[PDB]
């Protein structure tokens, strides 16, 4: 359920990425994957139903293996509703806000941000736009 947003020059501090769209009806998941070669530097994964609980799972994949998951229960998404995801890149973490409200922070595990060349956007959503700017 994939679209790739190329990031020429890679990820860099002050980069602000915005993803606008609408969650599909009866959604099961959404996923944003910042990729560095074969690795996934930052996986942002809202799960609409994990054992009857909503949860946002964040993680990193190195050497074909997922690491320690960071889980957040605050879940602002809703099936059939429009959403806005903003990811602000800082030197020490990815700062994520949904619908103009801070949601979570993910400390960098993959350190060479310049090598993170693209953001994969997938899941049960109708993607309107994916873009970025420098603040």
Swiss-Prot record:
Coiled coil: none annotated. The modification Phosphoserine is found at residue 73. A beta-D-galactoside binds at residues 66-72. A major expression is found in the colonic epithelium. It is also abundant in the activated macrophages. Expressed in fetal membranes. A motif (Nuclear export signal) lies at residues 111-126. Keywords: Acetylation, Cytoplasm, Differentiation, Disulfide bond, IgE-binding protein, Immunity, Innate immunity, Lectin, mRNA processing, mRNA splicing, Nucleus, Phosphoprotein, Repeat, Secreted, Spliceosome. One of its GO terms (biological process) is positive chemotaxis. GO terms for molecular function: carbohydrate binding; chemoattractant activity; disaccharide binding; IgE binding; laminin binding; molecular condensate scaffold activity; protein phosphatase binding; protein phosphatase inhibitor activity. Its main location: cytoplasm. Residues 3-133 form the Galectin domain. It is found in: Cytoplasm; Nucleus; Secreted. GO terms for cellular component: cell surface; collagen-containing extracellular matrix; cytoplasm; cytosol; extracellular exosome; extracellular region; extracellular space; ficolin-1-rich granule membrane. Probably forms homo- or heterodimers. Interacts with DMBT1. Interacts with CD6 and ALCAM. Forms a complex with the ITGA3, ITGB1 and CSPG4. Interacts with LGALS3BP, LYPD3, ZFTRAF1 and UACA. Interacts with TRIM16; this interaction mediates autophagy of damage endomembranes. Interacts with cargo receptor TMED10; the interaction mediates the translocation from the cytoplasm into the ERGIC (endoplasmic reticulum-Golgi intermediate compartment) and thereby secretion. Galactose-specific lectin which binds IgE. May mediate with the alpha-3, beta-1 integrin the stimulation by CSPG4 of endothelial cells migration. Together with DMBT1, required for terminal differentiation of columnar epithelial cells during early embryogenesis. In the nucleus: acts as a pre-mRNA splicing factor. Involved in acute inflammatory responses including neutrophil activation and adhesion, chemoattraction of monocytes macrophages, opsonization of apoptotic neutrophils, and activation of mast cells. This is Galectin-3. It comes from Homo sapiens. The chain holds residues 117 to 250 of 250 of the full protein.
């Amino acid at each position: 359920m994939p679209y790739n947003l190329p990031l020429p020059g890679g990820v860099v501090p002050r980069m602000l990425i915005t993803i606008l769209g609408t969650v599909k009806p009866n959604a099961n998941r959404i996923a944003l994957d910042f990729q560095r070669g074969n690795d996934v530097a930052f996986h942002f994964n809202p799960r609409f139903n994990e054992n009857n609980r909503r949860v946002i799972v964040c993680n990193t994949k190195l050497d074909n293996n997922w690491g320690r998951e960071e889980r957040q229960s605050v879940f602002p998404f809703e099936s059939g509703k429009p959403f806005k995801i903003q990811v602000l890149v800082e030197p020490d973490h990815f700062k994520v806000a949904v619908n103009d409200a801070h949601l979570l922070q993910y400390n960098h595990r993959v350190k060479k941000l310049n090598e993170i060349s693209k953001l994969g956007i997938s899941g049960d959503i109708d993607l309107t736009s994916a873009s970025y700017t420098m603040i």
